[PDB]
Design a protein around this ligand. Sequence first.
Ligand SMILES: Nc1ncnc2c1ncn2[C@@H]1O[C@H](COP(=O)(O)OP(=O)(O)OP(=O)(O)O)[C@@H](O)[C@H]1O
Lengths: 109, 109, 96, 96, 96, 97, 444, 80, 85
Amino acid sequence: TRAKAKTRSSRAGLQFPVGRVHRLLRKGNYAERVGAGAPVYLAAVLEYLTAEILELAGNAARDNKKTRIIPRHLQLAVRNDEELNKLLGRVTIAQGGVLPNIQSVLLPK
Amino acid sequence: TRAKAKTRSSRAGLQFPVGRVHRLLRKGNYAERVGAGAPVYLAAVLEYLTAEILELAGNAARDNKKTRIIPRHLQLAVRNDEELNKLLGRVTIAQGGVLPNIQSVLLPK
Amino acid sequence: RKTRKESYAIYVYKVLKQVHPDTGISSKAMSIMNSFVNDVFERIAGEASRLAHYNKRSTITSREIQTAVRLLLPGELAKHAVSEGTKAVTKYTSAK
Amino acid sequence: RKTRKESYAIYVYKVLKQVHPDTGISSKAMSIMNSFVNDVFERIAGEASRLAHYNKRSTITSREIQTAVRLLLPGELAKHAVSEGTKAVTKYTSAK
Amino acid sequence: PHRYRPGTVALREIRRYQKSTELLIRKLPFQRLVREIAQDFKTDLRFQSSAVMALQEASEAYLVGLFEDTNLCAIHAKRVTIMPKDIQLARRIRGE
Amino acid sequence: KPHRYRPGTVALREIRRYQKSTELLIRKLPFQRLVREIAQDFKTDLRFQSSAVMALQEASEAYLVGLFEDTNLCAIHAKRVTIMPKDIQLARRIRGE
Amino acid sequence: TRFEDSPSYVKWGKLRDYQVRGLNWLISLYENGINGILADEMGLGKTLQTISLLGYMKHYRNIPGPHMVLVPKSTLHNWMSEFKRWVPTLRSVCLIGDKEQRAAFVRDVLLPGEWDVCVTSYEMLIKEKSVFKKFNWRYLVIDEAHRIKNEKSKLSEIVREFKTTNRLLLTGTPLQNNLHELWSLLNFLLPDVFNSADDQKLVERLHMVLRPFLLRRIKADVEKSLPPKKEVKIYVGLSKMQREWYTRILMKKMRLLNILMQLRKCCNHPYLFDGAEPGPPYTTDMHLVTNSGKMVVLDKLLPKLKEQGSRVLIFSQMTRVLDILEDYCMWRNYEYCRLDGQTPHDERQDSINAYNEPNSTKFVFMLSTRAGGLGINLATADVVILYDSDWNPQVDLQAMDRAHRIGQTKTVRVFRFITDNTVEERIVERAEMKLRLDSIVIQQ
Amino acid sequence: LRDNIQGITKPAIRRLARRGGVKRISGLIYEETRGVLKVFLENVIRDAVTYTEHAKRKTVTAMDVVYALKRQGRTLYGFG
Amino acid sequence: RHRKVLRDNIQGITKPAIRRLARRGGVKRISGLIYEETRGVLKVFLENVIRDAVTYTEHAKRKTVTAMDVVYALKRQGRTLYGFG
DNA sequence: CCTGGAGAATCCCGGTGCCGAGGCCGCTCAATTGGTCGTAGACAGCTCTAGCACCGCTTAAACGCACGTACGCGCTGTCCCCCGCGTTTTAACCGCCAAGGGGATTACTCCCTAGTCTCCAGGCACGTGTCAGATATATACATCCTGTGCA
DNA sequence: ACAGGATGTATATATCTGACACGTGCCTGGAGACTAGGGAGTAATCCCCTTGGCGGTTAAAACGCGGGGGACAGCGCGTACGTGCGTTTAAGCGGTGCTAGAGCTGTCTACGACCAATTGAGCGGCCTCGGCACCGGGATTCTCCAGGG
Ligand SMILES: Nc1ncnc2c1ncn2[C@@H]1O[C@H](COP(=O)(O)OP(=O)(O)OP(=O)(O)O)[C@@H](O)[C@H]1O
């Protein structure tokens, strides 16, 4: 007899796949061995970052009167936050556009 | 009995440690298997690069009327050479100084 | 049928419905999120690999992941990330 | 007795004697050359590792090393280094 | 007759293009340029449409950032019109 | 009556002299004290190897020298000879800080 | 084996039997080709013996060759004056000054070579080593031999690099912390004898191997004058504020990397620290004295001394509290004299000697373990107060026997204030064990 | 054929500048922009062609372009 | 009573030292407000580097910052230093 | 030189099609459970190396101050270059079709690399001595800057 | 516009020293020989997706033109920095003393790799509908003359 299959993500109460993260860690040639808690830690971090960016994008979409998040909303959210902006400083988001700003000298006198 | 030991560097005509490079490739977590030709090729490339930089540095040291090579000579060789400058663009050489240059607008006239 | 591809799309959708219950996401935005997750995974895993090599060890552990998170993420993001990971590992060990 | 430390010093010295027979090198210069060789080795090895992962292959070969050289080295250096590597592999295969 | 002052239409265009998010260069000319550049490196080379789209996206982002830095330089020089010297100063400070 | 050089010659002489020499220009002890003060905030009870402080000083000096090069370029761009905080800020903004 | 009385070439000579027999001993060592240590512990004198030896060398078989004497910079004027007023017939030069002055002096004196003895300091010796090596040295005199007591020190290696026909060492306490520093001194003396580092193993071996190359005698058993000093410890307790300071610092922002040092002068005085140092300089009034039990004890002792001698001379360990107490005595309602490392070198020798007065009614002089050199006896001093003790008992011995020269024909009392359950107990026990080692090695 | 850099037109360069945020444009900017675009594209296309030739293919893919851009420090999100 | 603080450590970076750095860079005339700006820039740079180095040292479970830690931190920030390990 | 209208351009409200997002199904492959075993690292123990708190002496370097001169900065005129608008031409754009190349998948075989055991020489640590370089010192050259005539 | 004077600098010479190059001993990691196994090469097949073309349309580019504002050169000024000179200070080097802490050794366990069997989680394939794009019309707002303020 065997118990019902409980996922490690279920054990940690997460939404990201601990099993998939573990397989990616093992098949990526990062080290000889991978401990039991490292996939859980990494999955929690990935979930936190995803939740942050999605919350900011959802607020941006609410300000723009829509219900679907698009790359423009993602770009607005990422460039309007300083921490995420420094994290993604060297990244281009396709179909993202630019932040509206005009240098105050170009405005008519 | 067994044959007399020939180093693979001697086999390839190189003067760099093919065996040590093979060990480092295998222990560095870059893949699971390593071809025999890969350490030979890597050692050949390293040898060419080292010879080039050393030749430029020796020319600079002779221009300075010296028989030893110091980090100043190494920096003076790396700069003034385009390919090596691009290769070492983001590298600081300790106690190597700066290229001697003055913008032409600062010269009195 | 064609060969299977992997992605984080279902989990991204779960987190989206968790944080904002009445919002959807387009395919291009989902592709962007997938590439973002892949890139962050790559950065953290590579930093942990470098740490393990530097300290002359052969096991990636939670301490290495925590140190890589400290190195890569700035400030309050790092504080919250460390707290979240610690809660996750604590609960996983407690309920195991 | 201190633990032994491995370095490329003797090989750098041999190459120096080959290129400028009546010339010497300083200890700081040798440390700089040591770090330079380690850096180049790490960059080329990492590029080859990523190439192999991209192509779903598990072995690093002379093809991967050549492609890494072409990607990382600017132009004429790449051409000459590729010639050197071809000659070395040819010699290692022809009679060894 | 109604003619706007020389510079209001420019600000209207600035606002319009900073609110829009779509490409600005024409796709067929960009594709022909990409094939012209690829002609030197290898003969009879085929392309995917996604590759050309990604190349155009990256080119546009790079040029937009370049122009923003150029505007900063020109404003520093107490001008309003950007110049080749401003472009070259931006490139030199970036590191080309 | 005593000999004086006109403004703009001793500066050029110093430029050549320092662009030729390779010594470190900041005094070692004040820099070490500054490094210790900064490291005190992150984590108390810290010791430093003497080589670590020298590496830090090397990196700091190289960074400042490159920054001053770019700042000089900005100042020359503005048709000036004197560098200013505006030039420093512009150089840092373009380099991405 | 030589004359029993002073030679007829000394001037103002009053050297006694001990000094004349030491001179005979040194001359015999020179005749048989043996160097050594003139381990004259105390007032019996070593400058007189060294000068008389060199003068005998000149005034007997002609050896006018190079001779060098090494002194601290605080004794250059003293040594030159002693040479002038004892043996004027001998010629001496001094290498002192900035770079230009030193170059001028060597150029105008050293290379012409009209000199016979050159008096230099350690620092100038290190400066002009290449200049001195160009000479065939014969006799080398090093005062305070514990300066070179260890190898791997620049001065010791430099002074070994010199070549002399003869060597000679001068010290007060050759043994300080262990037998290896003494072995270093003996290695400098005779390189080719004590090449190796190595109850029967020691004590007897040390005596039998040191008798040929050393002379040891005690002023108490030689002069029979100079009534012995009486040493009394005062066991004090630390106030509650000091106790909580001590406990908190021991169990724990202010940088704290050295537990022993940071928990040291605590028993001395809390506000010697930083962080909670006295804040706004309101005024110099009754603030510092009330905070320390040792300060209370000293403030109680002062009246009992001023109703009597009132010429104490005080000792403490930390240069800060040294200067604090120095500028405090003047304020309180007293007067002082100044001796510390800040004072420019040449001015101290005349200043302190001048301050030695028939009467001062100033009641205070302050000297630390490292604020003074070797001279200026305070025969007017009566009481020695030691606020805290140094690790090395030899430093404290030098400090407390500084006033125990001949001038002191009166018994002097030394007071050692000590606290409880603090690091000072460890300091005291280490000093006692080191002193016991020194006694068992030398006296026995 | 040839002469396709002229396909990058003055109006397109003006639109790029207006998205950047500039108001007035000098007449000589256009050739400079064409030159810098040519340099950037040449670098990226050379890297992509190297990747494709290593793969032993004849078609250049979005994966190749993305890998080249990531190598240059210009990571692109939204293509895989 | 004698107890006070002399100066702050950021003032250890001296005006003639900054002028020597500017001379090596290639500058001829220097405005008076450059010095505080340079001190601030240096403080920011050192805070970043020291944070990363202390992170590495803490992972090692040590209490002494090493040259290797400084080199690893500098390579992380993208300023590879040759000649220290 | 503060107001008041034209007149373009923009935002807001409502209706229509449509196409991609989201829900739903089967299926297969990858994650889970269970058990076994070897090794990596945790833990304790000792050595000795190196770092921290501190003093004396030298002396270079920093600090402070006075004088003058380039230099940054503000203001003005000129003119020329770029912008706004209208018109004509060009080609991108879009929709659809046709064809072949080539990327992707499957099976089969075999050669190359992992792992082992042994042995031995190449590389490392340690001493040691000698020369390349830094140092000082006195010439000869180059550079700047002022001052007296007449350009 | 040069002559000359004072300043700085490049150059030749002699000494002395510490760092580098060479040798010696020794040991640990690489080379030789072998055996198994699975990853990659090779062939063959399929289908999708890239290219080539063709026509109709309309947005976009190219060209011209007038005119206003911004760039650029000039001039004046009054002030902030460079240069030189005296005085103080703190860095640099050297010793002192101490103890922590980094580094190597040995033992032992508990933790992760490996394997086998099961099954449910996720992925490709479908379909339907609501969110979005487009289109149109009215209300609103900003800009630019022109005048009377
Ligand atoms: N002319 C003299 N006659 C007799 N005794 C003298 C004479 N000069 C010096 N002394 C002795 O020297 C003692 C003090 O002299 P001084 O302090 O100069 O001694 P020192 O040679 O420096 O001794 P130390 O060995 O302690 O360094 C006197 O107490 C006395 O014993």
